[PDB]
């Protein structure tokens, strides 16, 4: 619902979505999602799991 959305919002009207009660197993994005930029600021990536 986030990375595979058909339509994205404009930057001046950027969309905000609440995420709650879920498991952030981002490895499922490894199959089809390729990201040019992935920068974490308040947490190290390797600890995200």
């Amino acid at each position: 619902e986030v990375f595979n959305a058909t339509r994205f919002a404009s930057v001046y009207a950027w969309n905000r979505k609440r995420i709650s009660n879920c498991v952030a197993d981002y490895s499922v994005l490894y199959n089809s999602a390729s990201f040019s930029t992935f920068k974490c600021y308040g947490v190290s990536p390797t600890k995200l799991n």
Partner: protein, 48 residues
């Protein structure tokens, strides 16, 4: 101006978006399942 003790060259081919994953403390498909750099990594990463 330096001499290097144990020079090892690790060569492979990845995606353009996965070049950023070649770092000591990165996560991702390549960093987790394919090629991981040590936290105390001493060396140089080159990609073209």
């Amino acid at each position: 101006d330096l001499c290097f003790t144990n020079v090892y060259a690790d060569s492979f081919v990845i995606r353009g978006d996965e070049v950023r994953q070649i770092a000591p403390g990165q996560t991702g498909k390549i960093a987790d399942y394919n090629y991981k750099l040590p936290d105390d990594f001493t060396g140089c990463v080159i990609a073209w």
